[PDB]
């Protein structure tokens, strides 16, 4: 899953 930013 990708980081928030």
């Amino acid at each position: 899953e990708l980081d928030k930013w």
Partner: antibody
Amino acid sequence: RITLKESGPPLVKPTQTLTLTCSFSGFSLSDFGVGVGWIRQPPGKALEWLAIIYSDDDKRYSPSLNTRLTITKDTSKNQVVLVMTRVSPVDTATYFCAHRRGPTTLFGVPIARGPVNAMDVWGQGITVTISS
Amino acid sequence: ALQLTQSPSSLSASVGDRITITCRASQGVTSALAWYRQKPGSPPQLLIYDASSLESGVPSRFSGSGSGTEFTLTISTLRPEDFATYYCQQLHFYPHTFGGGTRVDVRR
């Protein structure tokens, strides 16, 4: 100046629940993009990422620790809490909480997002041992 | 998950030496990478954020380069406080992986 500090019990027995508290100052978890994360360090070992929570209450956990962790924040009393259910001696480590900058905002806008790529300020850390 | 391998694990050096540590990701992490120095008894200290951005307060002898899967940390002139352990961290993916660390001790 930003500061974070970990508080909680130095000893916990196996199967028990560990509640760690991160009290900070110098920033608010109502501030844009800001996050507070937890990282532990077993005696003599590498850092292990545990979780992070942001000002919008967005939460992320370590996949391997997921079922046992709960992260939460109290915006009003600058406190981020980490609850770790049913611990074992492997949970024995130094627990750090740390600040993560949010994107740079210019008036309205986010011109810069490179600053989120790090945990810039860390707390002293708290040592927790798990023994029955 | 995502793998952060540091090289080398241990490094022998002397004051004034120029050293370089590398952090290798199993998948591209763009520029979302941080370097930290940790002295025994103390918490990690941010040196480099966003792969190359020098953190405020940190000495200019610290430098970071690379993107994607290859990252390097360079200490141009080793000072006594650099005899410590270094860590890299990836913040492009969850979970925010840390490398295994690189111990820098006094060479003899």
